């Protein structure tokens, strides 16, 4: 195999940044950082930007398929939901960056086999109360696809069987949250 060709990704992805320093409306604080559709370009971007652990509390990164905005209101997210990884304060140091990188690799590598098309993106929230990472999927009622994605993710993060993770619909998250599924 020749080596002058970049390694294309199945999807083009968009990286977004959030910091609550521009507007009192949530959506106006989102910044598109960049888009990429090869492995080499992914790494160029990843190597240029801060580790999640070095961001100020209140910031997010989001990696979404190009065409899907990183918000509940997108056509591909409104009926969807997320698998949620909740981290304690000490895990900012031990696990946040490695879990986020593994999440990015899961996404860009199409690691969910028959159900990769149900994946919309992923979000990391750096927060003083405890950081969160999540994979967002398009349809909270597809039990088979959602459960499969969760099991892949748990395996890729190396979480043991006694650590249970939960899936919440965005419709439930947005209302004033219960798990629809656990793995």
């Amino acid at each position: 195999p020749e080596h002058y060709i970049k390694h294309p990704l199945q999807n083009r992805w968009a990286l977004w940044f959030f910091k609550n320093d521009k507007s009192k409306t949530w959506q106006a604080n989102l910044r598109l950082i960049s888009k990429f559709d090869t492995v080499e370009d992914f790494w160029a971007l990843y190597n240029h930007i801060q580790l999640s652990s070095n961001l100020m509390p209140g910031c997010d990164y989001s990696l979404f398929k190009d065409g899907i905005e990183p918000m509940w209101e997108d056509e591909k997210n409104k009926r969807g939901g997320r698998w949620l990884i909740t981290l304690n304060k000490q895990q900012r140091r031990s696990d946040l960056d490695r879990f986020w990188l593994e999440t990015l690799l899961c996404l860009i590598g199409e690691s969910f086999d028959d159900y990769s098309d149900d994946v919309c993106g992923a979000v990391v929230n750096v927060r003083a109360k405890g950081d969160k990472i999540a994979i967002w999927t398009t349809e909270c009622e597809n039990r088979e696809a959602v459960t499969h994605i969760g099991r892949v993710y748990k395996e890729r993060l190396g979480l043991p069987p006694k650590i249970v993770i939960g899936y919440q619909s965005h419709a439930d998250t947005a209302t004033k949250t219960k798990n629809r599924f656990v793995v």
Binding site: H7, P8, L9, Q10, V39, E40, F42, W43, N47, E102, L105, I108, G109, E110, S111, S116, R156
Partner: peptide, 13 residues
Amino acid sequence: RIIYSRLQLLLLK
């Protein structure tokens, strides 16, 4: 579909 294992992605860094 274009799939990459974890190893493949890291080698290409």
